[PDB]
Each structure stands twice: as C-alpha cells, then as structure tokens.
Design a protein around this motif. Structure first.
Motif, PDB file in Angstrom:
ATOM      1  N   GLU A 130      20.294 -46.803   4.999  1.00 52.62           N
ATOM      2  CA  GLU A 130      20.491 -48.093   4.985  1.00 52.62           C
ATOM      3  C   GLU A 130      20.177 -48.456   3.542  1.00 52.62           C
ATOM      4  O   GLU A 130      20.576 -49.485   2.914  1.00 52.62           O
ATOM      5  CB  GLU A 130      19.570 -49.031   5.837  1.00 52.62           C
ATOM      6  N   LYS A 172      23.463 -48.921   1.536  1.00 53.13           N
ATOM      7  CA  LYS A 172      24.548 -50.201   1.671  1.00 53.13           C
ATOM      8  C   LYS A 172      24.596 -50.900   0.319  1.00 53.13           C
ATOM      9  O   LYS A 172      23.627 -51.342  -0.301  1.00 53.13           O
ATOM     10  CB  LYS A 172      23.878 -51.161   2.775  1.00 53.13           C
ATOM     11  N   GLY A 173      25.922 -51.022  -0.001  1.00 48.65           N
ATOM     12  CA  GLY A 173      26.366 -51.802  -1.054  1.00 48.65           C
ATOM     13  C   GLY A 173      26.352 -51.110  -2.377  1.00 48.65           C
ATOM     14  O   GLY A 173      26.603 -51.548  -3.350  1.00 48.65           O
ATOM     15  N   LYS A 225      27.294 -47.593  -5.060  1.00 53.09           N
ATOM     16  CA  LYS A 225      28.327 -46.860  -5.224  1.00 53.09           C
ATOM     17  C   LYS A 225      27.662 -45.550  -5.297  1.00 53.09           C
ATOM     18  O   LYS A 225      26.934 -45.299  -6.407  1.00 53.09           O
ATOM     19  CB  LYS A 225      29.219 -47.295  -6.452  1.00 53.09           C
ATOM     20  N   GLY A 239      27.612 -47.870   4.764  1.00 52.76           N
ATOM     21  CA  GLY A 239      27.755 -49.308   3.781  1.00 52.76           C
ATOM     22  C   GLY A 239      27.931 -48.949   2.454  1.00 52.76           C
ATOM     23  O   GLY A 239      28.312 -49.846   1.581  1.00 52.76           O
ATOM     24  N   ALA A 240      28.202 -47.641   1.848  1.00 56.64           N
ATOM     25  CA  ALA A 240      28.047 -47.356   0.427  1.00 56.64           C
ATOM     26  C   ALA A 240      29.753 -47.172   0.224  1.00 56.64           C
ATOM     27  O   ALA A 240      30.776 -47.159   0.929  1.00 56.64           O
ATOM     28  CB  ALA A 240      27.465 -46.052   0.111  1.00 56.64           C
ATOM     29  N   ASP A 280      26.092 -45.748  -8.724  1.00 53.18           N
ATOM     30  CA  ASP A 280      24.767 -46.108  -9.043  1.00 53.18           C
ATOM     31  C   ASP A 280      23.887 -44.907  -8.559  1.00 53.18           C
ATOM     32  O   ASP A 280      22.817 -44.895  -9.064  1.00 53.18           O
ATOM     33  CB  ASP A 280      24.408 -47.177  -7.671  1.00 53.18           C
TER      34      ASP A 280
END
Length: 316
Positions: free
Chosen positions: A138, A141-142, A144, A160-161, A181
């Motif tokens: 988790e 999530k969000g 890259k 969610g990546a 990221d």
C-alpha cells in the motif's frame, strides 16, 4: 569469444559480482582449454545496448551475455517467470529449479529460441526511494515506481502505483531526474549503480525478500553448437561452477548493501515475514493470473514452478 553485460566493469577481485563472475568463467575456461578458447569481456553496455543483447545472441551475432532473463518477456512471454514474486521464496528453492521439471522446461524453451543456459543466477532485491521507504504494498499507492518486469509491475499497478519500464542501467538517471519516485533492483545493483546518490531510503532483503530476479549467463546456441564437444562440455562445466559463486556473492551483497546506504545517510529498513507474504499474496491474484493466461507455455511453467513451493514445504 565475447561476453557482454550492462553492469559496471571492474576486475576479477573487485566490482559487481556479475562482472567478476564472467571474468572468473573466462579465466577458468581459458586455463582448462589452454588458449583454445579465449574471451573478451564488454561491461557497461560497451559492446551494444542492453536491449539488443538477447536478440543478438539468438541470431549468433553475440557469443555470450549475462542479462536479466525477463527483459525478453515481450518477445517470449514464458521468460516473464524470471521476475515474479511468490514463485521464488528463497535462494535454495530458486536454485533447486535447475534440475526439476520447471528448470528443464525453461531450458527447453530457451533452446528453441536459440539460447544456451550457461550459469543459473538468482538475485534478491529491495527498493530505493527518493522519499519514504516503500515497505508495504500500500506504500506504493500514488508513487511512480520501476518494478523491473511486467509481472512485478502488475503487482505495483494493483497497489495503485504508476509503473515505469527501463533496464536497470537506466535507473540512476531516471531517479536523478525525478522520472520516478522509487526503483526496485538487486542488492548488487543498488551498490554498483551507486543509487545511494539518488535516493533517501532503502528497503533491503536482509530479512527476506519478495523480489528475486533470474539473471543468467547465456550463450548463442548457434555459436555453442559449432564448437567441438570438448569445448562445449567445458563451457557447461565451468558454467555450473559459477552458480556457487553467484549464490555466495548475492547473499553477501544482500548484507553489505545496508551498510553502504547507512553510511551514505539513507534510511534503511528490512522486511518482515508478514510484509513479504502480503506482496506474494497480491502476486497470486495479479501477476500469476496475467502470466498463466498469456499462453500454454506460461501456464505450464507456472504449474511446474508451484511444485517447487510444495517441495520446499513438504520434503526434506
């Protein structure tokens, strides 16, 4: 004979273990063959780009290379098994594949595509991040993130990546320039690509890993088959000997990477068994489904790989 790879060059005694491995291989084959076979090593993509090595071998245009196998999963989907969490849980179990039905089948598939497996090499990994450590699924999530293969990325996408595809020799620049990221790669690569210069946090494989990538030394079948039997046998014999070297080196790097990053000022964390299982459970629902459905060859390799999970639990 030319040996090409994407990793940094060094000496026999010092550097990226994959570069050392192929230099030890060359040196031992030379010694045993008495000049009959000589080698030239081309590290750091000095011969050709990373993505051209596999196809070049298949065509007999390149003698040998050490490459992450699953980089070729676009043209041969079966090869995506080289990085797919949940199917490999330990080095012992991963190397056990070689003589079992799964390894025999992988070897068969590669032979049909023009490739000889010279040395099996498996490497545990981790995650370097420009911000917070990426620990739980988790956490992705969000973000890259470069997972390293289709199937690693399918897990990340579920979490969610946004995912980014590039060979590992391109991670440093992409992290540096903010194109992502976080990146997953091997312990050895975290060291040799100097990613402590472009990250603030590292999740290690010290207490286990979900990421294990197959990065074998391979040879063109067209070239190998033309050699005399005594030379073929020698390449295979020395090739197999390199596997113990890879085993010991990868484990050592799994440990040493932590100190490299700590000394550089990074936040360094490990993985609990509970966390590892969370990533592997997502894999079964995502990656394993994608892989198995792709073609009958993938389904077969998945089934055979699963047997090695049961053997690991129920045999001694």
């Amino acid at each position: 004979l030319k040996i090409s790879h994407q990793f940094p060059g060094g000496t026999i005694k010092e550097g990226d273990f994959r570069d050392r491995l192929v230099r030890n291989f060359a040196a031992e084959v030379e010694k045993r063959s008495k000049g009959a076979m000589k080698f030239e090593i081309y590290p750091g993509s000095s011969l050709m780009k990373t993505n051209a090595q596999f196809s070049s071998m298949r065509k007999g245009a390149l003698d040998m290379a050490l490459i992450p196998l699953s980089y070729a999963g676009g043209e041969v989907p079966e090869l995506n098994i080289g990085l797919m969490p949940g199917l490999v849980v330990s080095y012992e179990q991963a190397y056990s594949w070689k003589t079992k039905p799964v390894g025999i089948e992988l070897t068969r598939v590669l032979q049909e595509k023009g490739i000889v497996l010279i040395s099996w090499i498996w490497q545990a990994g981790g995650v370097a991040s420009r911000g917070k450590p990426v620990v739980e699924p988790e956490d992705a999530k969000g973000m890259k993130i470069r997972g390293g293969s289709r199937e690693m990325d399918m897990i990340l996408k579920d979490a969610g990546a946004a995912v980014v595809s590039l060979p590992s020799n391109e991670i440093y620049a992409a992290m540096q320039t903010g194109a992502m990221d976080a990146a997953m790669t091997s312990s050895t690569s975290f060291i040799s690509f100097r990613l402590e210069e472009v990250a603030k946090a590292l999740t290690t494989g010290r207490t286990g890993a979900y990421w294990f990538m197959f990065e074998p030394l391979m040879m063109s079948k067209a070239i190998f088959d033309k050699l005399p039997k005594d030379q073929r046998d020698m390449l295979m014999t020395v090739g197999a000997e390199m596997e113990k070297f890879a085993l010991e080196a990868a484990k050592k790097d799994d440990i040493d990477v932590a100190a490299v990053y700590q000394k550089a000022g990074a936040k360094v964390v490990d993985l609990s068994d509970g966390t590892i299982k969370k990533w592997q459970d997502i894999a079964r629902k995502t990656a394993w489904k994608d892989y198995g459905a792709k073609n009958e060859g993938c389904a077969k390799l998945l089934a055979l790989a699963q047997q090695t999970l049961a053997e690991n639990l129920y045999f001694q």
